Symmetry: D4
Subunit: 160 residues, 8 copies
């Protein structure tokens, strides 16, 4: 019942995107916490969060941010846990700024980066699930059921 | 002694980049295999590789490709294992095509994407290690030692 | 009456774009099938589809996808038939990701790529028609009639 | 012995790229002609070339150009034959201008566009072959042999 | 009363942009014609138009197009008159494709390129006016009056 | 013998590009001056140059600049003469910054923009010539001869 | 009560963006003037404004512009005061043109550039405040209060 | 004699760029310190550096970083001092990732961003000087002398 994934984001408006990650973890019954942590406005909150993540029992952190998106990278700077990054779509540059500022981490501190926007949020949750499935065979079966339903549910022909 | 990470790439020329992942896993004492699998020229080889990866005891797959880089995404389509993608730098577009064709996966099938080029290959090995560290406390200690040494090795002032 | 062109797409929402290809083939009376095949969610459906395409009497495949758009390329990996690719406009990056992930095929496995969006869908159908016109003189005459009407119908002066 | 494919390019400097298409057609025993036609410096030469191509027995045209690359699109404006476009890599913008000015044809006049540079030239010859293979079962067998050999030649592991 | 500027565009929908050029020439009392000429759908109409432009008394041609925008360049290929190009904003790529396919003319055949969209249309008309002002002192005075009013009319402080 | 075109550039390093415009005007026997004027380091020099250009008998100004390239736009702000802009290729962004900062003038003050680099410089001289040819039938004949020779010099086939 | 910051912009429509700078300075009780100055339409107004800025007691200039955005750079060309630049979002290219034409100043004349759009306007005001805080300890305390409230006000968890 | 500007960078390889800022501050007789601080490998070093900067008597911070360049933004998160950011040119993306990850700060925490590469480093030192000149009339006189000499040194015509 204690969280094994932390979903964090810089602001309330990021939640429109990150709620898709939150929903997916819930559907797969992965205990998690969903929090606002701003790299730029609450840097000490972030330092404390990432530094204590492991010892609190978190296994994976999903971090979402837009623009000059620094939250995932700085989070990875302070934890050895895998950090997954979701570029939030920005108004002017449509998440191209978010994408580059998250994915282009220099060697030594990784961030596993997902697609811009809602698809990325969903896939960060699914990637976290595939990571946790390595430790948890019940979850591994639920994830397989999910992928099997995803595959079987694709229609054969489009509708008008 | 059996591999727990698979490093795959479309061609020999990709190895100039992916060798950095290979070396880093060796440095961390993570048993792995390093193979050529082409999404476009050996699509059946890829299907079999990805499909059987879990049952062969693989935990993580690192896939590198450039240009219309489809190896990581298609690998993830056939395995429930976590798949990490390395955009290989391309001649004309300098890995921007590689990057977008790997990271922009629609929701449902993730690829955790790292930086373009050698940095990404290195960080894919480290992200893979941080995943395996959740299962293996000895590796977790090696990774923490790696990170601590990285931090301690940064000098305080530049040389002129 | 048996299909000689297959139009395939990853999802129902791609059909808003790909229906323009479907309409054009119908207007030119080119027998075709219009299907959903997802590279990422139904990779085995795709392998079977492309592998058997030729022997089923298909002559050309038109494949549409968005984002990390892998459907056309993987389809070309499994058939010697000409494969035409339509980049579907994506939400954030407006099909620039779709375009690069389709057009930048390395040498050995081609995809003939058309414009992003509806114009590309229409032109993939027209390109398939110009290919089939090489085998079928009645179609060749209908295609010439189409191009002649297209040319003659352009007005000389704009309206307010 | 008469050409069934025309390879055209705006300048001698384009041949460094387009020679790969020329060589591949020769490898597949496809009779072809290889010519310079400049959209901007010889627009009447282009009009006559494209307009008479079909009646001269050409089945496919491969056109390469760079920068504001107009040769393929204008060629397609005057022939009902399938026109394949190769973006030639440009100095400053590295073929991104070439690519967009070829692929983004509005609906009504297609150009099947290949990758920037040598890969695209090679794949234009292969796409042209896959088109002609629909008319010519001997060529179809050569193409299938080409593809089979390509697949078989991929090694299983990289060299260090 | 005979036209000294020709404004041409590929389609009716370009007129939403090019009408700003038409309006400006009218405001400055520059006799002009405003026409639809499609590079891709009416290439012979274009050849005839550009070839005869000079002898018909045209002094400047303003050409607008979007996407793979070939109209200005091909027009310049057939006339020694100055050709001004207006990139029309395209749906997906917002005129970035239009811009590159117009401005990146290789040396030998120029197109003087203006901004994407309505601003470019207005400025193509103003640039044509500054060209014609070199021959016509009454126009030169009207153009100076225009620039003087433009300058004097800028407010000093913004409004809420 | 007095100059009718002014070629201006921000620095000596720009001349590697702008010399092509200078040489072409000389080839066409167009009297001109070639000067350094920096928008950023000599803004008063620019104001005086542009402001007095018309009264000194200049008909056209060719301005080259790179990076945040402001010389052409600011020159046009102070003269009613036609101003042609040459984006000089920049180190990091390869003239894309130069290009956008010159071509994207808001409506009211035009700059006729040419290709990035040497091609643009050459085409600015040719566009300037085509403008002056409207005033000068001898130059018009030289330009027509230039264009005819260009067309005749294109070979029919490439060399291997 | 005399202004110590000047906020300038090229047009009324820029005010939708620049009003955020105006509001922030007011909130921090920084005396300022908010003005329209167009680089392209009122270049002499700009020369006079920047040249006299220092002697009028201005300490910082915040300049906003879109498209080929020349206002900040030219302003910096005529004053030794720090000039902060706000790229205004443009219709087609979404401020990517504004950004490059402001930030890529060559060495010798700086512009401190902020984010595209409203965020940039707000931050230009905050950056001006942090500059003025070096001279004014009461302001420095108000700025600290602002940053402290900004930090403390970030919620811990998102809302549905 | 105590430093009033801090120049910080993530690595030795950044100094090739940041040395230009260091040299320029020395040329203007501005006491400063030049240090390595890595946002990703020494995040606690960064927190302490930025947090204590003001109390140590620093007035301005110049921070350089490349790729996912987080050093300037995170530095600004912990200090109320003005922070100036220099995008260091990256291998693949040529500083476009560096640029966007520095300049696109959301509202609330500014970074005054300079040009990619050496020009930006030089202009960060000059912008820092123009800030300190507000506090120090002797420096203000040196800066005005620097600017006057820059202006006077521009030659009137290029060398061939």
């Amino acid at each position: 019942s204690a969280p094994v994934v932390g979903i964090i984001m810089g602001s309330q408006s990021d939640f429109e995107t990150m709620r898709h990650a939150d929903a997916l973890l819930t559907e797969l019954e992965i205990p998690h916490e969903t929090l606002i942590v701003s790299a730029h406005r609450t840097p000490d909150r972030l330092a404390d969060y990432a530094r204590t993540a492991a010892e609190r029992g978190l296994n994976v952190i999903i971090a979402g941010a837009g623009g000059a998106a620094h939250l995932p990278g700085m989070c990875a700077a302070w934890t050895r846990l895998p950090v997954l990054g979701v570029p939030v779509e920005s108004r002017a540059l449509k998440g191209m700024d978010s994408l580059l500022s998250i994915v282009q981490m220099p060697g030594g501190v990784p961030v596993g980066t997902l697609a811009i926007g809602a698809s990325g949020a969903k896939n960060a949750a699914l990637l976290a699930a595939s990571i946790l499935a390595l430790l948890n065979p019940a979850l591994a079966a639920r994830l397989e059921t999910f992928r099997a339903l995803q595959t079987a549910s694709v229609p054969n022909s489009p509708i008008t």
